Structures are given as C-alpha cells and as structure tokens.
Amino acid sequence: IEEGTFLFTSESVGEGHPDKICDQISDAVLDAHLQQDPDAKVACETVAKTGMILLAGEITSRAAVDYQKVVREAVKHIGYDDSSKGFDYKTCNVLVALEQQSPDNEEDIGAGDQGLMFGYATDETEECMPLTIVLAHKLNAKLAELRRNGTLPWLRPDSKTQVTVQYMQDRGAVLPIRVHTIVISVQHDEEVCLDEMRDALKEKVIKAVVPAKYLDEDTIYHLQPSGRFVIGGPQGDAGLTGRKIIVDTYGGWGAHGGGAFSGKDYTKVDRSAAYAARWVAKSLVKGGLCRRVLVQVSYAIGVSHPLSISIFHYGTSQKSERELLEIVKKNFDLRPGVIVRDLDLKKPIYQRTAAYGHFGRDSFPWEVPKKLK
Template identity: 30%
Template sequence: MSSIIFLFFYNFVKISLLFYFIDLFIVKILYFMSVKISECVSLGHPDKIADYISCYILDEFIKQDPYTKYALEVQVKDNTINLAGEVSSKCEDIDYKALCQKALIDIGYNKDYIAKWGGENVINYEEIHVNTFISKQSQTIAQGLSGWGDQGIFFGMAVRNESTDYMPFDYFLAKDINKKLFASNLGGLDIKTQVVTKGNDITKIIVAIPLLNNDTKNVEEFVRQNYKGNYELIVNGTGSYISHSSIADCGITGRKLVVDFYGSGCNIGGGSPWTKDGTKADLTLNLYARKKALDYLKSSNKDYIKCQIGCCIGRKEIEVIITDKNDEVLEFYVENRLPEEIINEFNLRTPIYSLLCKDGLFSRI
C-alpha cells in the first residue's frame, strides 16, 4: 500500500514539475516575444525640419484661405531649401523664403544657436536659398474631391495603457526621452533616441545628441535620473557629434513615418500625413483610423486594437476593418463618410498643422 502511495505522489510530483517547466518555458517565450524596438527623432532632425517647413507654410495658406488645396514636398541640404508640389489657393501673396526662415527660428535654429554652434555646423536661416517648383493642383484630382482625393490604405491602433497615451510602451518611451532631451538644453537640437524593451522593462537606450565638448556625462546622468532600471545606455556611439541639421544630412519630407505613427507597434499605409491639407486621405483617414481604434478599445475588453481603412478616389465609401492583437477580425463594414465631415471633426480648416508636426500627429485625439 505504501509503495502505491509513494508511486502516486512520485508521479504527481513529476507531472507537476513537467507542467511547471512547460509554463515557465511558455512564459519565457512570451517574454522574449514581447521584445520591442522603437526610435524617435526631434524636430531639429533634418527630415523633421523638412516636414515642419511644409506644415508651417500650409498654416499661412490656411490662415488666408481655409479651403486651400496643398501638397508641397520639401528638401533641405546645407542652406538650400527646395519646395516642390502643387498649391491651389485664393491666397497669392506668400513669401516662401520668409516663412522658411520663421519655421527654422521656431524650431530653435535662431541667431544665438547659430553663434553657439557655428554656421559650419548648423543651418543658418539668414543664409538660406529657397527654390520653388510649385504649380496648381491637377484638375483631374480636383474633380474627384466630392469624394476622397486618392485611393489608399490607412492604419490606426491603440493599446490599453492610459499612462502611455494608449500608445505602445517602447514608442512612448523613445518619444518621451527625446522630448525631455530636446527641452533640456544639454546639447543640440538634432536628437535621435532608440529603446529596446522586454515587456515593461527597459533593456537598452541609445541617444545621439550634438555636444560641443563630446562629454556625454551630463546626458547620461539626465537619462539615468529620469528613467530608472538596469539597462545599457549608449550616448553618441561614434564618440563625436557636432555638425548637425541639414549641414550633416539632407532632410526630406515624409522620411520618418514610422516615428510619426506607432514605432514598431503597427503597420503603416506608407503615405505621409505631412505636406498635405485635410482633403488628402493620407492625413485625414490616418487620424480617423487612430480615433476609431481608440474608441473601440475604450468600449471593449481588448488590450490592443488595430483599425484598417481603405478608400477610393472620387468615392465617399470607406472600408473599415477592426482587429485585435492576434489579427482576429472583430468588425468589418462599409461606412459613408465625406472628407469634409472628417475634416471638420479634426478642425483641419484651421492652422494647426505645424502644431501637429511639433506635438505629434495624434496629439489632439
């Protein structure tokens, strides 16, 4: 009898241990599956300088004509700025060079900053040369604007974490570090941050920030004080970072889309939300997709919601797909929404474009 009892408990322990290690193994797999990497760049980065200049000019058009049709790309290299695209507006009196100068000053590339860093290291608003290649909007596109102005796919997402503005933790963290460093005056304005997270743990932070003396100590202390944890911290991996902005790198609009949207947390449609007025689906339907994802998340028990939207030029119908983190379709339907309805919902007839570029595409949702 005792041997039977012994065998029973022996097998029970073996099975329990087996399930314990299986559970442990699954937990570890899930833990490492949750490894995420995201980066962020500041408004002083050359690509964001280009985005901001386009948005800044658009705001000036909108102030004078809220129904301006606008699609203007920007390229910035050294002190040369190229503006190319299409604009149709009742506003004709636009000083493009003056607006580019004001945009640069607003970012922080002002006279004191240039004196501190030297004109050989940063863009100089007083010395810029602006080339314009701007025509009126195509009549073919204009004819379709009773519906959507283009075809395309657009994505929105939301996670159940109010403390990260319903954004993925890794994305929020990379952006938060960047914003704090940008406001700290510890270095220059052209800042890149990147993080690696496992679940809610930080494992690595990478910072690239212009420093005149190459002394990274103050930046390292600042990051450690603001973000606790046992993580690897790298500041200026090449050792020296002085020349920056468009002097160090050519900036082009729409080249930091993953940074502008959700980091590695969600698909993106590929179209830039910047450089365009509210009639363009690349702006309006990306905002709408984010709002739909956020609204659905708040009304459900899900931890992650993704919304995909598709549209057709000249038509008002949009296809909407709502999925969870396992890509299970929760809802699929067709909705009739005119561009003007969503434009009004997000106040896109008002000069808010430079604020969206500065604060974040979804900062007003």
C-alpha cells in the same frame, strides 16, 4: 521566463533632424496658407542640405504667403541660428520652386484612390500608444526642453533616439516589463566632453523621462555611440519631407499603408482618414471595449463611404470583431468630407504635428476619444 517574452524597438528624431526640419517647414507652409484660405490645396515638399531650403510642389490658394518669413522663422524656432551650428536661418538660401495657381456637397466627396488606412491603439500607456515610441518621442522632447532652457547649453537641435522594450504577452495585450536598450545620439558643441554628455543623457534626460520601474542594472545604454556629433543638421545629411513616416505614426507597431502626412492639406485622404482611423482605435481602447486594436479602413475610388472596415482586437475583447464593427458604424462616419468637418481639419493646426509624432498627444482632435453609444 525567456520563452514568453519578446523585444520590440521604435525610434524618434528631434526637431533638428534634417528630415524633421522638412516636415515642419512643409506644415508651416500648409498652415500659412490655411490661415488666409481655409480651402487651400497644398502639396509642399521641402528639401534641406548644406545652406539650402528648397520648396517644391503645387498649391491652389488665394493666400499670399511670405516664404522667407515662414521658412526662416521655422528654422530659427528649431534653433539653427549660427554657422558654428552648421546652419543659420539668417543666411541660408531659400529657393522657392512651388507652382501656385488661383482657384476657379462636401459629405459626398469620393475617395481619390482605392486604398487602405490603419488606426492602432494599445492600453500600455495613458496616451494609448506603444511604450517604445512614446519614450523615444519624449526623450527628444526632453533634449529640446533642456537645450532651450539653458540647462544643457552644449546641446544642438539634431537628435535621434531609439528604445527597445522587453514585453510579455497577456492574452493578446502587450505588457511592458522593462526597457532593454536605449540609444541617444544628439548634436553638440565643440567644448563639451563625452563623459559629461553621457552622464547628462542618463541622469537629466533618461531618468527624467523613463519611469524608474522600467530601468534596471541590465538596461543597455548607447549614449553618443559613434563618439563626436558636432556636424549635424542639413550639413551632415540631406533631409526631405515624408521620410519619417513610422516615427510619425506607430513606431513599427500596427500597420502602415504608405502615405506621408506633412505638406498635404486635409483633402488628402491618406492624412485625414489616417487621423480618423486613429480616433476610432483610441476610442475603442479608452471606452474599455478592447486592450489593443488595429482598425483597417478600405476605400473604393470615387466612393465616399468606406468599402469595408475590419477590426482586429488581438483577442483582447469580450466582444466579437463583428460586434465591434457595429459599434464603430453606429458611432463614426468615415466619409472623407465628414471626417474633415468632425475633426475641424481646415484649421492651421499642422505644424504642431510635424515633430514628436502625430499620435499620442492630447492637443489634437483625433486624440480626444469619442464616448461610444
């Protein structure tokens, strides 16, 4: 019945979306530093516009990093290798305005600020993520796969997707019923016709990614909805690091306290503690303690242990929220310097996080649920 259902929408963007190009370059720079100096402090912003990658920010590191190589290899990997595509790693301007200095008990490091971090998890997918954002990410990944394997050789790197799912409530848990609307816009070459693109997007992309049970004759498809998308990448739109923070996290679900992730080393609590909060939420759901949960961790400036933790289970547990809090405190140490140790965050793992979401992928330590005792 209409009266018990609701719609929810999330979006994702491809590796060649100009904002995502900047996130990936910022984390490539972070990784390059961490490979040589595990204690590097990095706050690297990237700006991309026609013919230009500009790096700005502050670094304290012993590393000697070849920025030409880091930037150009990232752009090559993304797939911008010719003027005909709007951007070329071989010929773009790389401007380095980074200010790098040399440097002069980790468990007791105080929080740098008073602040709030959220973790979220939901049993609606195997990834413990909202279906809307999982499907949106996977659609972009599929486009990249078919571009790179030459199945759809007219594809270019810039893309955006958006998925609206129709849900019912099930005692605080959310149950996906059907995909209501899908949007896909993807950059393309000058030869391919609109109808062939739209057919490919439906048959080779959407039907390869979205389970058939969620698609029906009423599902609305907006495929290349503005018509041609030849001009794209940084030529079409300036990009900046930290401008896809909702794409990076929960797609509008749960909550967000405000910090961007990319270009920031693990001593930035707004990255590492966000990862740890996710780890807690996912562990609660995978442990069968709730179906859906929002974990809200507050820190007091200069204090290592969290000031307060609140667990909101949306009514999806037999346990009280106080009981869940006891379980969390028994099983997790959310001091910033201890999170870094437990999730091994000094490793150069960050470039992989910078497209397709920081959450919902099994290859990251914060996505391996902890067995709860």
